[PDB]
Design a protein around this ligand. Structure first.
Ligand SMILES: O=C(COC(F)F)N1C[C@H]2CCC[C@H]2C1
Ligand SMILES: [Zn+2]
Ligand SMILES: [Zn+2]
Ligand SMILES: [Zn+2]
Length: 459
C-alpha cells in the first residue's frame, strides 16, 4: 500500500450534475479512461493520476486548488480557477482573464504552474472538489506517459512541448504548452456531507465565495489543508530541503541563546518558566536561574488561551521571574515574557497559505500556525537588535574593516574599540538575526528590558 490503486472505487455522486447518468460503480481505472487518458499498462513510475491522502500530505508544497465552472461542455466556454487567484476563460472555437482558445490557455497554465511551483516542489497536485468539468477539461492541457527527466537538467519532468517534442521541469519550461504527468486528489472522496462552501465556512472566515472558479479553488485547497494539517497532525513526515531551512534553524538557536542569556543578566530573574516544546532543553545551560519546563505542543488550530495554559491549579506563580514562549503561540502574553512568534503573513518558499488566516510553515516538518494577531503582544514591546558577549577578546585563526556599533555589547566596545574577534562574531550574529527575522519570526520582550543593564556585567 504505497500508491492509490487504479482499481479503488471512486464515488461519482458529486459528478452527476455536470455528468448525468454517471455509473454509481466507478474505479480510478475507468474514470481516467473516461477522461481521455490511456494508461496502456505502464510500470514507469506513474501508477495513477490520482493519489492517496498520505501521498498528498507528503507533497503538500505541490498543491494547487483547481475548479472549473461551466460559464455558459465543448459547446460552452469554461472558467478555469486556480488557488493562485487566477481565472482563465477557455473557448472551444481574483484575476479574471477574457475568453481565449485552449492552445493559448494551456501555455498560460504552464507559465503559472511553473512560476508558482519551481522553488516549491518537483510536481503539481491538482486539489479538486470534483463536480465533472475539471476532469473533462484536463485532456486539453494535460499529457501523460512514463516518468521522465528535464531536457535541460536532472529534475523530473513536469511540462511538455508539442513544438519541440521535448520535456522540462518547472525551471526550464519557458514556451512549454502541456502539463506533463500531474497528480490530483478529490477532496469529495473523503466523506463530506454537503457542498464546498458549507464545509469550508465551518473552519475559515478569511476566504469568501465571490462565485468565481478561483474562489472555489482557494476554498478547496484551504479545506484540504484544514483536514490534513489543522485537525490531523503528523509531525513524523519529513520534507525536503528547498531553501534556507538550515541557516534559519541555526539562526533561531543562536538568537534564542543570546536573547534569553541577556535577559537573565540584565534582570537576574530567579525563575524561568519555559512554556512550549515538550522536547526542549535549557537554551542557556550555564545560567544561574531555576529552569522549570511546561509541555505544550504547537497549536495548529487556534492560539492557546493563557487562562487555560496557566490557571485551574508547576511553580503555579507564573508572575515570579520570566516566561519564555519560544514559538508557543498564545492569545495574550503575560507582561513578564520573552516571546518568539512566527508571523504568518510573511511571504516565502517555506510559508504556504493556510486555514482561517493561519499559514502552513514547512521547515523539515509541516506546522499549521494560527493567524498572527498584533494584540497578543499588548503587555510586551518589540525586542531590539543587540549582540552581547562576555567571551575574551581573542582573534584565533576573512578580512577586517573596523566595526563601529552602539548595539555591540562587549568589553572592547566598553573600552572604546571593538576587537577583530567580536567584530566577526557581531557581523555573523547580525546575519543569523536578519535571516531569522526575514524568515518571518518576530521577537518581543517585557517593557523593562534595557540593554544598558548589560554593560555593568563586565566589572
Ligand atoms: O472524455 C470526456 C469528454 O467527452 C469526450 F467526448 F470528449 N470526459 C472526461 C471524463 C470526466 C468524467 C466523464 C468523462 C467525460
Ligand atoms: Zn530542468
Ligand atoms: Zn479558507
Ligand atoms: Zn572583544
Amino acid at each position: 500500500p504505497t500508491h492509490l490503486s487504479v482499481d479503488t472505487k471512486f464515488k461519482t455522486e458529486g459528478l452527476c450534475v455536470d455528468i448525468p447518468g454517471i455509473p454509481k460503480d466507478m474505479t480510478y481505472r475507468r474514470l481516467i479512461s473516461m477522461m481521455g487518458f490511456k494508461m496502456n499498462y505502464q510500470v514507469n513510475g506513474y501508477p495513477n493520476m490520482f493519489i492517496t491522502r498520505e501521498e498528498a500530505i507528503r507533497h503538500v508544497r505541490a498543491w494547487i486548488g483547481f475548479d472549473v465552472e461551466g460559464c455558459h461542455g465543448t459547446n460552452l466556454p469554461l472558467q478555469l480557477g486556480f488557488s493562485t487567484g487566477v481565472n482563465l476563460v477557455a473557448v472551444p472555437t481574483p484575476l479574471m482573464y477574457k475568453g481565449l482558445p485552449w492552445n493559448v490557455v494551456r501555455i498560460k497554465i504552464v507559465q503559472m504552474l511553473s512560476d508558482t511551483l519551481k522553488n516549491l516542489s518537483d510536481r503539481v497536485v491538482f486539489v479538486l472538489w470534483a463536480h465533472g468539468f475539471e476532469l473533462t477539461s484536463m485532456k486539453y492541457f494535460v499529457k501523460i506517459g512514463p516518468e521522465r527527466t528535464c531536457c535541460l537538467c536532472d529534475r523530473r519532468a513536469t511540462c511538455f512541448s508539442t513544438a519541440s517534442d521535448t520535456y522540462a521541469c518547472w525551471h526550464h519550461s519557458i514556451g512549454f504548452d502541456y502539463v506533463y504527468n500531474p497528480f490530483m486528489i478529490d477532496v469529495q472522496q473523503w466523506g463530506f456531507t454537503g457542498n464546498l462552501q458549507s464545509n469550508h465556512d465551518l473552519y475559515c472566515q478569511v476566504h469568501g465565495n465571490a462565485h468565481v472558479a478561483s474562489c472555489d479553488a482557494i476554498m478547496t485547497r484551504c479545506l484540504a489543508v484544514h483536514e490534513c494539517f489543522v485537525k490531523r497532525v503528523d509531525w513524523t513526515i519529513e520534507y525536503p530541503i528547498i531553501g534556507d531551512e538550515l541557516k534559519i534553524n541555526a539562526a533561531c538557536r543562536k538568537v534564542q541563546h543570546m536573547v534569553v542569556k541577556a535577559a537573565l543578566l540584565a534582570d537576574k530573574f530567579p525563575v524561568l518558566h519555559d512554556i512550549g516544546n515538550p522536547k526542549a532543553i535549557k537554551c542557556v545551560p550555564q545560567a544561574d536561574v531555576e529552569w522549570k519546563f511546561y509541555d505544550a505542543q504547537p497549536c495548529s488550530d487556534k492560539a492557546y488561551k493563557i487562562e487555560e495554559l496557566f490557571y485551574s491549579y508547576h511553580s503555579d506563580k507564573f508572575t515570579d521571574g520570566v516566561c519564555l514562549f519560544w514559538n508557543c503561540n498564545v492569545d495574550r502574553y503575560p507582561a513578564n515574557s520573552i516571546v518568539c512568534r512566527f508571523d504568518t503573513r510573511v511571504l516565502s518558499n517555506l510559508n504556504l497559505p493556510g486555514c482561517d488566516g493561519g499559514s502552513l510553515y514547512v521547515n523539515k516538518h509541516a506546522f499549521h500556525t494560527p493567524a498572527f494577531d498584533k494584540s497578543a503582544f499588548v503587555n510586551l514591546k518589540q525586542l531590539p537588535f543587540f549582540y552581547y558577549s562576555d567571551s575574551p577578546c581573542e582573534s584565533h585563526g576573512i578580512d577586517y574593516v573596523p566595526l563601529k556599533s552602539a548595539t555591540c555589547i562587549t568589553r572592547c566596545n566598553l573600552g572604546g574599540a571593538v576587537c577583530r574577534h567580536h567584530a566577526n562574531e557581531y557581523r555573523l550574529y547580525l546575519d543569523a538575526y536578519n535571516m531569522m527575522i526575514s524568515a518571518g519570526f518576530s521577537l518581543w520582550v517585557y517593557k523593562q528590558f534595557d540593554t544598558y543593564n548589560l554593560w555593568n556585567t563586565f566589572t
